[PDB]
Amino acid sequence: AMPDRMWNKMVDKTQRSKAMPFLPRPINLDGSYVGDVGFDPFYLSSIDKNFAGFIQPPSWEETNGLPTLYWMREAELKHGRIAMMAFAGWLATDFGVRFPGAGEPYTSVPNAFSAHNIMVDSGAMWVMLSLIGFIEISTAAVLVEVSKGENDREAGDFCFDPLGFCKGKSADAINTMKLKELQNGRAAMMAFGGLATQTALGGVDFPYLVPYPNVAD
Amino acid sequence: ADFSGEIGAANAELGCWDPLNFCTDQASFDKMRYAELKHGRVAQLAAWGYATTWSGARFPGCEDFPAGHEAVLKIGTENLIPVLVVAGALETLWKQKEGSFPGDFSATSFPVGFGPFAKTEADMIDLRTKELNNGRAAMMGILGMIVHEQIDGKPFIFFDKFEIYAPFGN
Amino acid sequence: AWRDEVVVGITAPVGFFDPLGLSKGKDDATMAYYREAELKNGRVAMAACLGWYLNAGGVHPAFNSELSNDPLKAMVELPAVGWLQFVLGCGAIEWLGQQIKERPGYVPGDLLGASYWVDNSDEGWVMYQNKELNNGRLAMLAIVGMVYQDVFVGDYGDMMYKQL
Amino acid sequence: AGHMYRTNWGIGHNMKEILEAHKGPFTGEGHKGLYEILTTSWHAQLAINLAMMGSLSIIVAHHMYAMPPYPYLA
Amino acid sequence: FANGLVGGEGPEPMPFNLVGEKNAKNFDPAGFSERAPEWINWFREAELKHGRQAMLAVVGMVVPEFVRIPGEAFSFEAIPNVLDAHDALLDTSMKQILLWISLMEAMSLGALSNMNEFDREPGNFGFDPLGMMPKDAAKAKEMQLKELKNGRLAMVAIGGMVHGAITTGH
Amino acid sequence: ANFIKPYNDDPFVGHLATPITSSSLTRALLKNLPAYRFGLTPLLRGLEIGLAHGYFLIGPFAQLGPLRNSDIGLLAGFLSTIGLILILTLGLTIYGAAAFGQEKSNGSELQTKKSWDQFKGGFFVGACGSAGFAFICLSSIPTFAL
Ligand SMILES: CC1=C(/C=C/C(C)=C/C=C/C(C)=C/C=C/C=C(C)/C=C/C=C(C)/C=C/C2=C(C)CCCC2(C)C)C(C)(C)CCC1
Ligand SMILES: CC1=C(/C=C/C(C)=C\C=C\C(C)=C\C=C\C=C(C)\C=C\C=C(C)\C=C\C2=C(C)CCCC2(C)C)C(C)(C)CCC1
């Protein structure tokens, strides 16, 4: 009606998306972040909300607010890293690899598709949860600091480079490297889906296919 | 333009109720008015006929014919053709009076007009309005009846047929 | 001009909505009739919706809950005396409404005469009025949908949110 | 429920704000001014508290006979 | 006339136009365009979409030989009537189809949300993989006109097709 | 928005313009009631009021009176209603005498002796007749069944 539409504020009509020529370009995907092909059909990057409020209630204190892209990038990176890790583990477990010095519980496991249940029953999953939680809390606080505007860390930057693969490297090269991580991560995320749905419906194997003629569920 | 003055306006406020703007100029209005009147007059007679027949009355030599639209389907076409011939003739006879409201056939060969029925201009307008209104009602009525006949067989919805009280006719 | 003055009814999802342009050449009086009809049809729909929902739910504590839960079956079961009172009563209110309409300053749809205290300058007033209209518009469509379901599909209960 | 009102950590509700916001077309300024009254008048507080306490006692009487709460009481 | 949208301007004839010329030039008897100028863009987009879908529907109807498709469930031999397929594979294939159609359609909302303010040409989703659209505007418009004309034909075509079957052995 | 304002814009009168007191509905209903309607003569005002009040009074007596279950219950109810109407009529007569006096002049002002007397007379006729109408109606009740 009369009120000015937020469409104007959440999209740049002058320019247009690259992956999607028809759609206009989201005003936030300006290319600063790596891997930006201007792809946000749902214009989620343009949503105005400090998602950092999840970690710390906004009412607690006045903060500048973490830009949406920062939060979104964080999640994308995290999801990707986790997915890549999971994929490797699934296959290795399928190959039979078990912990060095492990015992019957691990050895007996029939297939990765069945490991979760047996492990949760064993209780080891609980142990992992507590450990993972510690990591989450120890590393998450940084986001609040960034939103507060008191720190200038970038998304995914945990200053973690033991082997110095990227130490003293041309910025352009660091860029391609980080993109490589993102690309591999995105691939892994999609990969896990089949590694799950297919296995559930069909059976676990190197191809993890489902008996087309036979039932799946 | 403003046809509010024309007879048959819905009411003082709405004026001419033309939802789809069929009428644009006086020329069109005259066309539409003529049609409305013709359909109206025809319908008024139709309702009367349908009721008479459906209730059971039949002319001499028509005691075995069916009633309703069923008649048109079953009764011989040969005995229906007369209707067309008696109607087409009338179509030719009626003569529109120039410079007069649509549907005025005063110029017809046989005497036709307000005659003794109307005196003042107001009386004329009243009779005209009543003719139009009753026609409008019948137009809806004949449809309502036929539709319900097909739907349930009850053309009158609440009763099967009318019973007449004609003392002198007896 | 109605189009140049109307404020209530124009909302965010679609703004002014007249795809078929059924109001382009209409005068103020015709447009007033339309708005009054819109509101009345909508308000009656809202009420009908609530009635159907209650009956379908089974909360019809009248006549010893003898009448059926199916709203359409119940109507047939209701004695005519009940229906006559309904029509006549509504007719009475209609007469009074006509009196109010004739009075100078009538705003189409206002039977409480809220014009005496508030005008459309107040945004709160226009907004609340919009809510009535919007909910009424939705209700109109709903009552038409529900009847279809009961008469053709064969159900008179929610087939959308029932599956928790 | 005890974590609904603000104290010293930002999060929470301020009763004054809640009361003042609730005003309508038929009630003028609404519930404005009530907070000060109930935070500066013991008599006002006692009124509400005493009425509610008495009302509770009456409820206890009804609910404690229909639903006997103790062994060998009924 | 719209706002310059390619269309109409057709020698194509039509003797059943109740109101207006029998030609297809500027075919807008109802007159929705002038009454609702702001909806012209939307109407164009909807027209194109309906037509394009119809053009695919006809060929989909003309391939009831189960050709290029395996699977007993999909066997056109098993499901002789192409029409029966909708209910035949409703929960096995129709749902799948919906998934992709739905995802694709939702992604276009950004453009359609404010068509008037945005500059995208109605119906132009930048899809010319073979890069073969007459570069010349003169013919470019002609090409567009062909699409519209063929699409309009298709829309009507499908109706007859399907219905026809509803009244024949197929 | 305030739906309650001082009446007649007088902040000091003992009355308020609430939706109930001053709404189109209330105004319309009260304007057309026989008591305040414009044009009605004193007699007609009384008649309408009487016709209305007599019809609903026969009910209570007929269905809950001492002889309700008797075959002559409706007749008894009618008689009882007539008795009540007489009592009310006495009241009207007495009120007029005290409030208006003995000789009047204005005329056609419900608030004068002559007008009041005419009003009272109308009430009596209307009330008694209305009660009779109810007797005839309640004698045979329609089931409105087809
Ligand atoms: C609740 C309500 C309402 C109301 C209701 C009511 C209150 C009713 C009442 C009613 C009434 C209360 C009525 C009455 C009636 C009456 C009548 C109807 C009467 C009649 C009479 C007559 C007709 C006559 C008589 C006579 C005379 C006058 C004398 C001589 C003799 C004779 C008999 C002739 C309404 C619905 C609105 C709405 C809602 C609310
Ligand atoms: C509407 C209205 C109103 C209201 C009212 C009300 C709400 C209530 C009322 C109520 C009432 C007002 C009641 C009454 C009652 C009465 C009674 C209950 C009585 C009874 C009586 C009797 C029982 C008697 C008997 C007898 C006779 C008749 C004769 C002689 C002998 C003896 C004495 C035995 C007002 C006023 C505001 C205003 C106007 C309108």
Side-chain angles (χ1 to χ4, degrees), chain E residues 33-97:
Chain E
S33 64
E34 55 269 32
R35 286 187 305 278
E38 301 300 338
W39 288 76
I40 55 191
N41 291 177
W42 179 269
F43 293 152
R44 176 56 70 187
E45 174 65 72
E47 191 174 18
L48 288 162
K49 179 180 296 186
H50 277 84
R52 292 173 179 177
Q53 297 183 358
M55 297 171 55
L56 276 306
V58 48
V59 289
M61 192 92 176
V62 82
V63 287
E65 18 280 359
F66 188 43
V67 284
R68 290 77 193 91
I69 304 297
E72 70 296 334
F74 320 91
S75 171
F76 240 119
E77 300 69 21
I79 300 80
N81 304 3
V82 55
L83 305 78
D84 182 32
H86 178 278
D87 300 354
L89 293 63
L90 191 59
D91 300 356
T92 67
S93 303
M94 304 303 289
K95 294 182 176 179
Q96 236 259 18
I97 308 174

Coordinates of all heavy atoms in Angstrom, one line a residue, chain E residues 33-97:
Chain E
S33 N -7.5 -3.9 -20.1 CA -6.3 -3.1 -20.2 C -6.5 -1.7 -19.8 O -5.8 -1.2 -18.9 CB -5.7 -3.2 -21.6 OG -6.6 -2.6 -22.5
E34 N -7.5 -1.0 -20.4 CA -7.7 0.4 -20.1 C -8.2 0.6 -18.7 O -7.8 1.5 -18.0 CB -8.7 1.0 -21.1 CG -10.0 0.4 -21.2 CD -10.0 -0.7 -22.3 OE1 -9.0 -1.3 -22.6 OE2 -11.1 -0.9 -22.9
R35 N -9.1 -0.3 -18.2 CA -9.6 -0.1 -16.9 C -8.6 -0.4 -15.8 O -8.6 0.2 -14.8 CB -10.8 -1.1 -16.7 CG -12.1 -0.6 -17.4 CD -13.3 -1.5 -17.0 NE -13.0 -2.9 -17.3 CZ -13.1 -3.5 -18.5 NH1 -13.5 -2.8 -19.5 NH2 -12.8 -4.8 -18.6
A36 N -7.7 -1.3 -16.1 CA -6.6 -1.7 -15.2 C -5.3 -1.6 -15.8 O -4.7 -2.7 -16.1 CB -6.9 -3.0 -14.6
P37 N -4.8 -0.4 -16.1 CA -3.5 -0.3 -16.8 C -2.4 -0.9 -16.1 O -1.4 -1.4 -16.7 CB -3.3 1.2 -17.0 CG -4.2 1.8 -15.9 CD -5.4 0.9 -15.8
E38 N -2.4 -0.9 -14.8 CA -1.3 -1.4 -14.0 C -1.1 -2.9 -14.0 O -0.1 -3.4 -13.6 CB -1.5 -0.9 -12.5 CG -1.6 0.6 -12.3 CD -0.3 1.3 -12.8 OE1 0.8 0.6 -12.9 OE2 -0.4 2.5 -13.1
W39 N -2.1 -3.6 -14.5 CA -2.1 -5.0 -14.5 C -1.6 -5.6 -15.9 O -1.5 -6.8 -16.0 CB -3.5 -5.6 -14.2 CG -3.9 -5.5 -12.8 CD1 -4.3 -4.3 -12.2 CD2 -3.9 -6.5 -11.8 NE1 -4.6 -4.6 -10.9 CE2 -4.4 -5.9 -10.6 CE3 -3.6 -7.9 -11.8 CZ2 -4.5 -6.7 -9.5 CZ3 -3.7 -8.6 -10.7 CH2 -4.2 -8.0 -9.5
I40 N -1.3 -4.7 -16.8 CA -0.9 -5.2 -18.2 C 0.3 -6.1 -18.1 O 0.3 -7.1 -18.7 CB -0.7 -4.0 -19.1 CG1 0.3 -3.1 -18.6 CG2 -2.0 -3.3 -19.4 CD1 0.4 -1.8 -19.4
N41 N 1.3 -5.7 -17.4 CA 2.5 -6.4 -17.3 C 2.2 -7.8 -16.7 O 2.6 -8.8 -17.2 CB 3.5 -5.7 -16.4 CG 4.1 -4.5 -17.0 OD1 4.9 -3.8 -16.4 ND2 3.7 -4.2 -18.2
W42 N 1.4 -7.8 -15.6 CA 1.1 -9.1 -15.0 C 0.3 -10.0 -16.0 O 0.6 -11.2 -16.1 CB 0.2 -8.9 -13.8 CG -0.2 -10.1 -13.1 CD1 -1.3 -10.8 -13.3 CD2 0.5 -10.8 -12.0 NE1 -1.4 -11.9 -12.4 CE2 -0.3 -11.9 -11.7 CE3 1.7 -10.6 -11.4 CZ2 0.1 -12.8 -10.7 CZ3 2.1 -11.4 -10.4 CH2 1.3 -12.5 -10.0
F43 N -0.6 -9.4 -16.7 CA -1.4 -10.2 -17.7 C -0.5 -10.8 -18.7 O -0.6 -11.9 -19.1 CB -2.4 -9.3 -18.3 CG -3.5 -8.8 -17.4 CD1 -4.2 -7.6 -17.6 CD2 -3.8 -9.6 -16.3 CE1 -5.1 -7.2 -16.7 CE2 -4.8 -9.1 -15.4 CZ -5.5 -7.9 -15.6
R44 N 0.5 -10.0 -19.2 CA 1.4 -10.5 -20.2 C 2.2 -11.7 -19.7 O 2.2 -12.7 -20.3 CB 2.4 -9.4 -20.7 CG 3.4 -9.9 -21.6 CD 2.8 -10.6 -22.9 NE 2.1 -9.6 -23.7 CZ 1.3 -9.8 -24.7 NH1 1.1 -11.1 -25.1 NH2 0.8 -8.9 -25.4
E45 N 2.7 -11.6 -18.5 CA 3.5 -12.7 -17.9 C 2.6 -13.9 -17.8 O 3.1 -15.0 -18.2 CB 4.0 -12.2 -16.5 CG 4.7 -13.4 -15.8 CD 6.0 -13.8 -16.5 OE1 7.0 -13.1 -16.5 OE2 6.0 -14.9 -17.0
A46 N 1.4 -13.7 -17.3 CA 0.6 -14.8 -17.1 C 0.2 -15.5 -18.4 O 0.1 -16.7 -18.5 CB -0.7 -14.4 -16.3
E47 N 0.0 -14.7 -19.4 CA -0.4 -15.2 -20.7 C 0.7 -16.1 -21.2 O 0.5 -17.2 -21.6 CB -0.6 -14.1 -21.7 CG -1.2 -14.5 -23.0 CD -1.6 -13.3 -23.9 OE1 -1.0 -12.2 -23.7 OE2 -2.4 -13.5 -24.9
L48 N 2.0 -15.6 -21.2 CA 3.1 -16.3 -21.7 C 3.2 -17.6 -20.9 O 3.3 -18.7 -21.5 CB 4.4 -15.5 -21.5 CG 4.5 -14.3 -22.5 CD1 5.6 -13.4 -22.0 CD2 4.9 -14.8 -23.9
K49 N 3.2 -17.6 -19.6 CA 3.3 -18.8 -18.8 C 2.3 -19.8 -19.2 O 2.6 -20.9 -19.5 CB 3.3 -18.5 -17.3 CG 3.4 -19.7 -16.5 CD 3.3 -19.4 -15.0 CE 4.5 -18.5 -14.5 NZ 4.5 -18.3 -13.1
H50 N 1.0 -19.4 -19.2 CA 0.0 -20.3 -19.5 C 0.2 -21.0 -20.9 O 0.1 -22.2 -21.0 CB -1.4 -19.6 -19.5 CG -2.0 -19.5 -18.2 ND1 -1.7 -18.4 -17.3 CD2 -3.0 -20.2 -17.6 CE1 -2.4 -18.5 -16.2 NE2 -3.2 -19.6 -16.3
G51 N 0.6 -20.1 -21.8 CA 0.8 -20.7 -23.2 C 2.0 -21.6 -23.3 O 1.8 -22.7 -23.9
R52 N 3.1 -21.2 -22.7 CA 4.3 -22.1 -22.8 C 3.9 -23.4 -22.2 O 4.3 -24.5 -22.7 CB 5.4 -21.4 -22.0 CG 6.0 -20.2 -22.7 CD 7.0 -19.5 -21.9 NE 7.5 -18.3 -22.5 CZ 8.4 -17.5 -22.0 NH1 8.9 -17.7 -20.8 NH2 8.9 -16.4 -22.6
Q53 N 3.3 -23.4 -21.0 CA 2.9 -24.7 -20.4 C 2.0 -25.5 -21.3 O 2.1 -26.7 -21.4 CB 2.2 -24.4 -19.0 CG 3.1 -23.7 -18.0 CD 2.4 -23.5 -16.7 OE1 1.2 -23.9 -16.5 NE2 3.1 -23.0 -15.7
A54 N 1.1 -24.8 -21.9 CA 0.2 -25.5 -22.8 C 0.9 -26.1 -24.0 O 0.6 -27.2 -24.4 CB -0.9 -24.5 -23.3
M55 N 1.9 -25.4 -24.5 CA 2.6 -26.0 -25.6 C 3.3 -27.3 -25.2 O 3.4 -28.2 -26.1 CB 3.7 -24.9 -26.1 CG 3.1 -23.7 -26.6 SD 4.3 -22.4 -26.9 CE 5.4 -23.2 -28.0
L56 N 3.8 -27.4 -24.0 CA 4.4 -28.6 -23.5 C 3.3 -29.6 -23.3 O 3.5 -30.8 -23.5 CB 5.2 -28.4 -22.3 CG 6.6 -27.9 -22.4 CD1 7.4 -28.8 -23.4 CD2 6.6 -26.4 -23.0
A57 N 2.2 -29.2 -22.8 CA 1.1 -30.1 -22.5 C 0.7 -30.9 -23.7 O 0.4 -32.1 -23.6 CB -0.1 -29.4 -21.8
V58 N 0.5 -30.3 -24.8 CA 0.0 -30.9 -26.0 C 1.0 -32.1 -26.4 O 0.5 -33.2 -26.7 CB -0.2 -30.0 -27.2 CG1 1.1 -29.1 -27.4 CG2 -0.5 -30.7 -28.5
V59 N 2.3 -31.8 -26.5 CA 3.2 -32.8 -26.9 C 3.2 -33.9 -25.8 O 3.4 -35.1 -26.1 CB 4.6 -32.3 -27.1 CG1 4.7 -31.4 -28.3 CG2 5.1 -31.5 -25.9
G60 N 3.0 -33.6 -24.6 CA 3.0 -34.5 -23.5 C 1.8 -35.5 -23.8 O 1.9 -36.7 -23.5
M61 N 0.7 -34.9 -24.3 CA -0.5 -35.7 -24.6 C -0.2 -36.5 -25.8 O -0.8 -37.6 -25.9 CB -1.7 -34.8 -24.8 CG -3.0 -35.5 -24.9 SD -3.8 -35.5 -23.3 CE -5.4 -36.3 -23.7
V62 N 0.6 -36.1 -26.7 CA 0.8 -36.8 -28.0 C 1.8 -37.9 -27.9 O 2.2 -38.6 -28.9 CB 1.2 -35.9 -29.1 CG1 2.7 -35.5 -29.1 CG2 0.8 -36.4 -30.5
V63 N 2.4 -38.2 -26.7 CA 3.3 -39.2 -26.5 C 2.8 -40.3 -25.5 O 3.4 -40.4 -24.4 CB 4.7 -38.7 -26.0 CG1 5.4 -38.1 -27.2 CG2 4.6 -37.7 -24.9
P64 N 1.7 -40.9 -25.8 CA 1.1 -41.9 -24.9 C 1.6 -43.3 -25.2 O 0.9 -44.3 -24.9 CB -0.4 -41.8 -25.2 CG -0.4 -41.5 -26.7 CD 0.9 -40.8 -27.0
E65 N 2.8 -43.5 -25.8 CA 3.3 -44.8 -26.2 C 4.3 -45.3 -25.1 O 4.9 -46.3 -25.4 CB 3.9 -44.8 -27.6 CG 4.3 -43.4 -28.1 CD 3.1 -42.7 -28.6 OE1 2.0 -43.3 -28.6 OE2 3.2 -41.5 -29.1
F66 N 4.4 -44.6 -24.0 CA 5.4 -45.0 -23.0 C 6.8 -45.0 -23.5 O 7.7 -45.5 -23.0 CB 5.0 -46.4 -22.5 CG 5.8 -46.8 -21.3 CD1 6.0 -45.9 -20.2 CD2 6.3 -48.1 -21.2 CE1 6.7 -46.3 -19.1 CE2 7.0 -48.5 -20.1 CZ 7.2 -47.6 -19.0
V67 N 6.9 -44.3 -24.7 CA 8.2 -44.3 -25.3 C 9.3 -43.6 -24.5 O 9.0 -42.6 -23.8 CB 8.1 -43.5 -26.7 CG1 7.5 -44.4 -27.7 CG2 7.4 -42.2 -26.6
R68 N 10.5 -44.1 -24.5 CA 11.6 -43.5 -23.8 C 11.4 -43.6 -22.3 O 12.2 -43.0 -21.5 CB 11.8 -42.0 -24.2 CG 12.4 -41.8 -25.6 CD 11.3 -42.1 -26.7 NE 11.9 -42.2 -28.0 CZ 12.3 -43.3 -28.6 NH1 12.1 -44.5 -27.9 NH2 12.8 -43.4 -29.8
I69 N 10.4 -44.3 -21.9 CA 10.2 -44.4 -20.4 C 10.0 -45.9 -20.1 O 9.2 -46.6 -20.7 CB 8.9 -43.7 -20.0 CG1 9.0 -42.2 -20.3 CG2 8.7 -43.9 -18.5 CD1 10.1 -41.5 -19.7
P70 N 10.8 -46.4 -19.1 CA 10.7 -47.8 -18.7 C 9.9 -47.8 -17.4 O 9.4 -46.8 -17.0 CB 12.2 -48.1 -18.4 CG 12.8 -46.9 -18.0 CD 12.0 -45.7 -18.6
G71 N 9.8 -49.0 -16.8 CA 9.1 -49.1 -15.5 C 7.7 -49.5 -15.7 O 6.9 -48.9 -16.4
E72 N 7.3 -50.6 -15.0 CA 6.0 -51.1 -15.1 C 4.9 -50.1 -14.7 O 3.9 -50.0 -15.3 CB 5.8 -52.4 -14.3 CG 5.8 -52.3 -12.8 CD 7.2 -51.7 -12.3 OE1 8.2 -52.0 -13.0 OE2 7.2 -51.1 -11.3
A73 N 5.3 -49.4 -13.6 CA 4.3 -48.4 -13.1 C 4.0 -47.4 -14.1 O 2.9 -46.9 -14.2 CB 4.9 -47.8 -11.8
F74 N 5.1 -47.0 -14.8 CA 4.9 -45.9 -15.8 C 4.3 -46.4 -17.1 O 3.9 -45.7 -18.0 CB 6.2 -45.2 -16.0 CG 7.0 -45.0 -14.8 CD1 7.9 -45.9 -14.4 CD2 6.8 -43.9 -14.0 CE1 8.6 -45.8 -13.2 CE2 7.5 -43.7 -12.8 CZ 8.4 -44.6 -12.4
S75 N 4.3 -47.7 -17.3 CA 3.9 -48.3 -18.5 C 2.7 -47.7 -19.1 O 1.6 -47.8 -18.5 CB 3.7 -49.8 -18.4 OG 3.1 -50.4 -19.5
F76 N 2.8 -47.0 -20.2 CA 1.6 -46.5 -20.8 C 0.7 -47.6 -21.2 O -0.5 -47.5 -21.4 CB 1.9 -45.6 -22.0 CG 1.5 -44.2 -21.9 CD1 2.4 -43.2 -22.0 CD2 0.2 -43.9 -21.8 CE1 2.0 -41.8 -21.8 CE2 -0.2 -42.5 -21.7 CZ 0.7 -41.5 -21.7
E77 N 1.3 -48.8 -21.5 CA 0.5 -50.0 -21.8 C -0.3 -50.3 -20.5 O -1.5 -50.6 -20.6 CB 1.4 -51.1 -22.1 CG 2.3 -50.9 -23.3 CD 3.4 -49.8 -23.1 OE1 3.7 -49.6 -21.9 OE2 3.9 -49.2 -24.1
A78 N 0.3 -50.2 -19.4 CA -0.4 -50.4 -18.1 C -1.4 -49.3 -17.9 O -2.6 -49.6 -17.6 CB 0.6 -50.5 -16.9
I79 N -1.1 -48.1 -18.1 CA -2.0 -47.0 -18.0 C -2.3 -46.5 -19.4 O -1.6 -45.6 -19.9 CB -1.4 -45.8 -17.2 CG1 -1.1 -46.3 -15.8 CG2 -2.4 -44.7 -17.2 CD1 0.2 -47.0 -15.6
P80 N -3.3 -47.1 -20.1 CA -3.5 -46.8 -21.5 C -3.8 -45.3 -21.7 O -3.3 -44.7 -22.6 CB -4.8 -47.6 -21.8 CG -5.4 -47.9 -20.5 CD -4.3 -48.0 -19.6
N81 N -4.7 -44.7 -20.8 CA -5.1 -43.3 -20.9 C -4.0 -42.4 -20.3 O -3.7 -42.5 -19.2 CB -6.4 -43.1 -20.2 CG -7.5 -44.0 -20.8 OD1 -7.2 -44.9 -21.6 ND2 -8.7 -43.8 -20.3
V82 N -3.5 -41.5 -21.1 CA -2.6 -40.5 -20.6 C -3.2 -39.7 -19.5 O -2.6 -39.3 -18.6 CB -2.1 -39.6 -21.8 CG1 -3.2 -38.9 -22.4 CG2 -1.1 -38.6 -21.2
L83 N -4.5 -39.5 -19.7 CA -5.3 -38.8 -18.7 C -5.2 -39.5 -17.3 O -5.1 -38.8 -16.3 CB -6.7 -38.6 -19.1 CG -7.0 -38.0 -20.5 CD1 -6.8 -39.0 -21.6 CD2 -8.4 -37.4 -20.5
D84 N -5.4 -40.8 -17.3 CA -5.4 -41.5 -16.0 C -4.1 -41.3 -15.2 O -4.1 -41.5 -14.0 CB -5.6 -43.0 -16.3 CG -5.7 -43.8 -15.0 OD1 -6.2 -43.3 -14.0 OD2 -5.3 -45.0 -15.1
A85 N -3.0 -41.0 -15.9 CA -1.7 -40.9 -15.3 C -1.8 -40.0 -14.0 O -1.1 -40.3 -13.0 CB -0.7 -40.4 -16.2
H86 N -2.5 -38.9 -14.1 CA -2.5 -37.9 -13.0 C -2.8 -38.6 -11.7 O -2.2 -38.4 -10.7 CB -3.5 -36.8 -13.2 CG -3.6 -35.8 -12.1 ND1 -4.3 -36.0 -11.0 CD2 -3.0 -34.6 -11.9 CE1 -4.2 -35.0 -10.1 NE2 -3.4 -34.1 -10.7
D87 N -3.9 -39.4 -11.7 CA -4.3 -40.2 -10.5 C -3.5 -41.5 -10.4 O -3.3 -42.1 -9.4 CB -5.8 -40.4 -10.5 CG -6.6 -39.2 -10.5 OD1 -6.0 -38.1 -10.4 OD2 -7.8 -39.3 -10.6
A88 N -3.0 -42.0 -11.6 CA -2.2 -43.2 -11.6 C -0.9 -43.1 -10.9 O -0.6 -43.9 -10.0 CB -2.0 -43.6 -13.0
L89 N -0.2 -42.0 -11.1 CA 1.1 -41.8 -10.5 C 1.1 -40.6 -9.6 O 2.1 -39.9 -9.3 CB 2.2 -41.6 -11.6 CG 2.6 -42.7 -12.5 CD1 1.4 -43.2 -13.4 CD2 3.8 -42.3 -13.3
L90 N -0.1 -40.3 -9.0 CA -0.2 -39.1 -8.2 C 0.7 -39.1 -7.0 O 1.4 -38.1 -6.8 CB -1.7 -39.1 -7.6 CG -2.0 -37.7 -6.9 CD1 -1.9 -36.6 -7.9 CD2 -3.5 -37.8 -6.4
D91 N 0.9 -40.2 -6.3 CA 1.7 -40.2 -5.1 C 3.1 -40.8 -5.4 O 3.9 -41.0 -4.5 CB 1.1 -41.0 -4.0 CG -0.2 -40.3 -3.5 OD1 -0.6 -39.3 -4.1 OD2 -0.9 -40.9 -2.7
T92 N 3.4 -41.1 -6.7 CA 4.7 -41.7 -7.0 C 5.5 -40.8 -7.9 O 6.7 -40.8 -7.9 CB 4.4 -43.0 -7.7 OG1 3.8 -42.8 -9.0 CG2 3.5 -43.9 -6.9
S93 N 4.8 -40.0 -8.8 CA 5.5 -39.2 -9.8 C 5.0 -37.8 -9.7 O 5.8 -36.8 -9.9 CB 5.3 -39.8 -11.2 OG 5.8 -41.1 -11.2
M94 N 3.7 -37.6 -9.6 CA 3.1 -36.3 -9.6 C 3.7 -35.4 -8.5 O 4.0 -34.3 -8.7 CB 1.6 -36.3 -9.5 CG 0.9 -37.2 -10.5 SD 1.3 -36.7 -12.2 CE 0.4 -35.2 -12.3
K95 N 3.9 -36.0 -7.4 CA 4.5 -35.3 -6.3 C 5.9 -34.8 -6.6 O 6.3 -33.7 -6.4 CB 4.6 -36.1 -5.0 CG 3.2 -36.5 -4.4 CD 3.3 -37.3 -3.2 CE 2.0 -37.6 -2.5 NZ 2.1 -38.4 -1.3
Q96 N 6.7 -35.7 -7.2 CA 8.1 -35.4 -7.6 C 8.0 -34.2 -8.5 O 8.8 -33.2 -8.3 CB 8.7 -36.6 -8.3 CG 10.0 -37.0 -7.6 CD 11.3 -36.5 -8.4 OE1 11.2 -35.6 -9.2 NE2 12.4 -37.1 -8.1
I97 N 7.2 -34.2 -9.5 CA 7.1 -33.2 -10.5 C 6.8 -31.9 -9.7 O 7.5 -30.9 -10.0 CB 6.0 -33.4 -11.5 CG1 6.1 -34.8 -12.1 CG2 6.0 -32.3 -12.6 CD1 4.9 -35.2 -13.0

